[PDB]
Design a protein around this nucleic acid. Structure first.
Lengths: 286, 188, 129, 169, 266
RNA sequence: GGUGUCCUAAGGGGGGCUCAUGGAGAACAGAAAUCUCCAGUAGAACAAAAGGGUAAAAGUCCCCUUGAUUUUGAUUUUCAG
RNA sequence: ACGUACGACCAUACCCAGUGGAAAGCACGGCAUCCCGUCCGCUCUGCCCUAGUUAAGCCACUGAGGGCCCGGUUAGUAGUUGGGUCGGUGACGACCAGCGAAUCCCGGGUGUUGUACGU
């Protein structure tokens, strides 16, 4: 028998579009955004961390009724402005991206005429409150040593109050419930990658050249990584809004509109579709 | 620009629901221009929002905590219907009526614990449930059984299931009494 | 304006005995020096909550750490009757230990930087003797 | 577009199966044979339904299997095709492009006979994929493989003939 | 309820002294216009957290039989419904249904003006966050009638719709959106529903200067058919329960500031 | 319902996975054992008695708790030689 | 306009197949020391972003067959409440009304959209 028939198609209920695309966990999202301990009617921020093959995407997001709003965004390709040119998806680049996003959020808020009702109703015994946000990892697996926690670590060091525990950091030991901050510092400054460079340079030179061809070409040794990442942290904390210009082709907005419409294929009209239908009917008759 | 408006009749408030009632008429212009109509409605909305913000910021206690600057709100006073009736006491069961008549006091929570001290083994054990004392001896290696009990015992049945049998009988009696009370309470 | 501290920034382990003294660097809060009962002093990078240097060489509890007013030296005083001066940018001890006390050294005080003469700094140490 | 390097047929995995049908020492010895052949710990399969005719019970271990990937799968497939003399039937190849066969003795692969273990037969099943199979397997943005990217029976028979120099009858 | 999860569900559905926030079920009849569906979508957007939505067509006429509404409320634990329909006589109708103990307490028809309806997407402004309660303003002389009428019932239902979750405290940053309903007594009066976002400006005083900016939706209603409550059912529904945290006052007995019980003699 | 057995109990939280069935394949293996792929809106399982229960789960397996009914209350109701 | 990250409506978006895709981005990909996890580095996790490739994912267009979504018609019609209001002893037959369907048929369509960063 035919399972996929007319009754099956009529009774089929589609999922949500992003569930069909495999991009959103709505079960997690509902508890992330629609649900809170306190009912003080306050806005909530989530730090969205996403990863590609060649980039790290960090955003500060609020949820509204017609779509999410991005308060601030930082990407790991903008680390070239601060001097990091290779390894833009490693755990340390995740740390630097989180630090950049934290400094950008604080600089946008001014914590580095229209005014707020908090300033209107502020009392004498009031203190500055930290910016608070909750982590959103998406579909990533939250195992010990993952890079979502590197981003969250960088943002918390940058000054965003993110509620977390330290048990998912690299160097954490389950048996002793103790964190090896030596291993944590090694991972922050990229010493795991540098140790891999030394290990490959000692054991397998061909794999060393193939994996780190760009490091060798740009003369980035293993021992320079710690000072490189520390200087990047300092430059991020100094100038969080430094402008970075890519090597991609640069046109204006309307020039890109024209360029893409030169390659867009037009929708066939009713007259053309009817003409093609009549041509098909004539071909079937002939 | 002023922060206080003047109208012939004062606003009333219900700050529990963040509600402001303006009993003054909204003199909507009798024109067909959507722009002036929505401008007039926006002015009415602005006046209501202004008096609501002033009332909240002046007659509610303000506390600055780590969460933020919070206004303490009064309980709501606008009468709104409930979704379900107010809970009522359940109908009195046969046991509850008997205990009320005989002056039987409810057992304390310490008295009714699922715990007892076995002297002979010198350990603490549960009175019932998994590995409870009501099933004592069903897993012991050696059990003395009287010959009269074996003579009166039906074939196939063992002594290792007698305690489960009497537990099942007591559970059945308690369930029958519970179902009888449920039916009587549903009849009432 | 200084705002009141409200939450934990970092909990950094690494000392094996109680912490007996702590002091930030005069330059910035990025560097912190702690002296403990495990016979060591430690520099901490407080930006990332990480250890920076572990200063070893005392054989008693490090009762005091003290930065020089310009921030170029760190002095530690211990119960082994000694005072040691360290370079905080490399974690290495400057010259040898300072000997001459008979009992435990309890407190340190640097000479103010506008009073330094003869091309050197002066350090006062108070002891149980 | 058929000459694209990303459409090259390759072995996804080779699954070796022994369905002894009885739990205990026989199943343990079959697991030992699978351990010696592969080099990795096997999987005990539990029976789904109780069949009185077969003498099996629900939640009773009756079979054992090993999934092998990489060049180890290629060398085990080479060993099995050496046993079968590189001759297969047209029925052995599926419509989805996978294939497989079976042997009745595990010794003639090249394992020395041990009387404490004995005699066992196996089912070999080889799965065939192209590069890009991650699309239907990854957790985020899982989707279907395109129809042109799917492997057919004629293609896998052609690949088998020009890879192993075998004969399909 | 043998399973603990089903026992939890039954305990959530049980009557309580302090009731849960009411849930609204959004549903439509066999014939329902696109304007009516858009209005239902805007109301659901304003009330996402405490609403459930049906997606099929229901052969239900609420002012003839409401047994299906009673069944749906009992099954979904939804004490409010917004029901959409369309006729030649009534082209765009939103029927607000409020119930008590899974039986219809009261009902009211709203007729939506199609030429003046603007959705939330037709205003390019920053929208309300999900789950955040707006403040409410009810303006005009239609709501102060000495006798209960359609406008009083409409005000009660709109307050019950937009009230959200009650709380004893509110953050001052959660005072950014207002819902304004305007209606005057008198040919048929028009109930106008508007939503605005609120910005604050300096005025040289302690109090800020409030300026409003339209958020949407823009709805115009004419009040239609009405189903009034049974008086005994209404008395039962308007009974109020006293929480245990509300002390029953005893004569000459008080609690001082240190928590001691104090007796007064004369 | 009656017997005879087995269990570090149920529950709770978190994580991973997807079911019944059909088609085509694989020594014994043959309608019915296990394994592989494709298709499968749930047509399985679990709760209830939907006229819209649940699918990166409310299903099923792992990890952690198993502490078998906590403490406080000038408050609610009943009682207290 | 195109792409990506979050989204909103949740099939006009789904089921099947073909053709094309500048730029960049996604993606497939390469390697398993370290973090981490499997019977299997399949998935998950880490490192590389070099090299290959648009084959697939993705996007656009096209095509059948379903399905789905709008508007009209059905039609103010069946049906149902009213001696309602007129006759009929009455039941009821018209009329006056109030609510008020669906089938069939016709016509159209096969995604719109918010924030941020880029091409």
């Amino acid at each position: 028998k035919l399972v996929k028939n007319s009754a099956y198609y009529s009774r089929f209920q589609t999922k949500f579009k992003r569930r069909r695309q495999g991009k959103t966990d709505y079960y997690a999202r509902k508890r992330l955004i629609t649900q809170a301990k306190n009912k003080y009617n306050a806005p909530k921020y989530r730090l969205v961390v996403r990863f590609t093959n060649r980039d790290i995407i960090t955003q500060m997001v609020t949820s509204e009724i017609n779509g999410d709003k991005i308060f601030a965004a930082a990407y790991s390709h903008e680390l070239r402005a601060y001097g990091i040119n290779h390894g833009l998806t490693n755990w340390a680049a995740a740390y630097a991206t989180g630090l950049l996003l934290a400094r950008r959020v604080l600089a946008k808020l001014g914590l580095d005429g229209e005014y707020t009702l908090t300033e209107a109703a502020e009392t004498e015994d009031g203190e500055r409150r930290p910016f608070k946000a909750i982590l959103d990892v998406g579909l990533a697996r939250t195992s010990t040593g993952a890079r979502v926690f590197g981003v969250m670590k960088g943002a918390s060091d940058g000054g965003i109050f993110i509620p977390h525990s330290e048990n998912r950091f690299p160097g954490y030991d389950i048996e002793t419930e103790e964190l090896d901050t030596e291993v944590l510092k090694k991972y922050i400054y990229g010493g795991h990658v540098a140790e891999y460079m030394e290990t490959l340079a000692d054991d397998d030179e061909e794999r060393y050249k193939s994996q780190f061809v760009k490091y060798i070409e740009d003369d980035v040794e293993a021992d320079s990584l710690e000072e490189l990442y520390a200087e990047a942290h300092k430059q991020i904390r100094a100038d969080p809004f430094r402008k970075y210009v890519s090597d991609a082709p640069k046109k204006s907005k309307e020039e890109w509109k024209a360029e893409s419409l030169k390659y867009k294929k037009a929708k066939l009209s009713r007259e053309e579709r009817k003409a093609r239908v009549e041509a098909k009917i004539k071909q079937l008759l002939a | 620009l002023p922060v206080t408006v003047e109208k012939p009749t004062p606003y009333t408030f219900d700050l529990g629901l963040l509600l402001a009632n303006d009993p003054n008429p909204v003199n909507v212009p009798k024109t067909t221009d959507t722009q002036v109509l929505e401008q007039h409605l926006a002015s009415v909305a602005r006046d209501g929002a202004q008096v609501l913000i002033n009332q909240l910021l002046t007659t509610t206690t303000i506390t600055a905590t780590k969460d933020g600057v919070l206004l303490t709100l009064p309980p709501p006073t606008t009468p709104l219907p409930r979704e379900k009736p107010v809970p009522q006491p359940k109908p009195e069961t046969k046991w509850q009526a008997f205990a009320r008549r005989r002056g039987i006091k409810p057992k304390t929570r310490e008295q009714r614990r699922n715990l007892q001290y076995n002297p002979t083994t010198g350990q603490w054990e549960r009175k019932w449930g998994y590995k409870g004392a009501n099933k004592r001896g069903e897993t012991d290696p050696i059990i003395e059984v009287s010959a009269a009990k074996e003579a009166m015992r039906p074939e196939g049945t063992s002594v290792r299931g007698d305690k489960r049998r009497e537990i099942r009988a007591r559970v059945k009696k308690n369930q029958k009494q519970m179902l009888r009370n449920q039916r009587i309470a549903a009849e009432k | 304006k200084v705002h009141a501290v409200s939450r934990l920034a970092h909990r950094i382990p690494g000392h094996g005995q109680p912490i007996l003294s702590c002091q930030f660097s005069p330059v910035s809060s990025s560097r912190l020096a702690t002296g403990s009962g495990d016979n060591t002093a430690r520099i901490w990078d407080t930006d990332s909550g990480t250890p920076k240097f572990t200063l070893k060489g005392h054989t008693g509890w490090v009762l005091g750490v003290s930065w020089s007013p310009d921030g170029k030296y760190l002095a530690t005083c211990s119960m082994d009757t000694t005072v040691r001066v360290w370079d905080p940018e490399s974690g290495k001890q400057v010259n040898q230990e300072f000997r001459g006390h008979a009992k435990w050294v309890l407190a340190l005080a640097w000479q103010p930087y506008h009073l330094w003469r003869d091309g050197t700094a002066r350090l006062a140490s108070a002891s149980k003797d | 577009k058929a000459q694209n390097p990303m459409r090259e047929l390759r072995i996804q995995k080779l699954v070796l199966n022994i369905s002894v049908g009885e739990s205990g020492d026989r199943l343990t010895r079959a697991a030992k044979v699978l351990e010696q052949l592969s080099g990795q710990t096997p999987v005990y399969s539990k029976a789904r339904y109780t069949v009185r005719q077969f003498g099996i019970r629900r939640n009773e271990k009756i079979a054992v299997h090993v999934t092998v990937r990489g060049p180890k799968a290629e060398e085990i497939l080479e060993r099995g095709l050496k046993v079968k003399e590189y001759e297969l039937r047209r029925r052995n190849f599926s419509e989805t492009g996978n294939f497989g066969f079976g042997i009745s003795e595990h010794i003639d692969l090249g394992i020395k006979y041990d009387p404490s273990i004995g005699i066992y037969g196996m089912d070999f099943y080889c799965c065939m994929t192209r590069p890009g199979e991650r699309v239907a397997k990854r957790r985020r943005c899982k989707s279907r493989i395109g129809a042109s990217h799917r492997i057919t029976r004629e293609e896998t028979i052609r690949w088998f003939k020009q890879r192993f120099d075998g004969i399909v009858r | 309820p043998r399973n603990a999860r089903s026992k939890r569900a039954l305990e959530k559905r049980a009557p309580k002294i302090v009731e849960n926030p009411k849930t609204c079920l959004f549903l439509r009849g066999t014939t329902c216009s696109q304007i009516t569906q858009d209005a239902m979508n805007d109301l659901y957007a304003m009330r996402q957290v405490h609403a459930k939505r049906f997606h099929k067509k229901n052969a239900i006429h609420p002012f003839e039989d409401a047994t299906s509404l009673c069944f749906f409320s009992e099954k979904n634990d939804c004490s409010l419904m917004v029901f959409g329909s369309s006729n030649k006589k009534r082209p765009h109708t939103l029927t607000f249904v409020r119930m008590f103990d899974y039986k219809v307490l009261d009902m009211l028809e709203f007729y939506l003006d199609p030429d003046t309806y603007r959705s939330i997407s037709q205003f390019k402004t920053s929208k309300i966050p999900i789950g955040m309660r707006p403040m409410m303003v009810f303006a005009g002389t239609a709501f102060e009638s000495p006798v209960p009428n359609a406008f009083t019932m409409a005000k009660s239902m709109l307050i019950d719709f937009f009230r959200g979750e009650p709380s004893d405290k509110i953050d001052v940053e959660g005072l950014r959106f207002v819902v304004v309903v305007t209606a005057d007594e008198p040919q048929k009066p028009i109930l106008r529903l508007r939503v605005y976002g609120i910005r604050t400006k300096r005025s040289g005083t302690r109090l800020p200067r409030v300026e409003v900016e339209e958020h949407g939706p823009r709805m115009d209603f004419r009040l239609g058919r009405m189903r009034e409550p049974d008086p005994a059912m209404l008395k039962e529904a308007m009974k109020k329960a006293k929480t245990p945290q509300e002390e029953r006052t005893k004569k000459n007995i008080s609690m001082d500031l240190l928590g001691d019980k104090i007796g007064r003699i004369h």
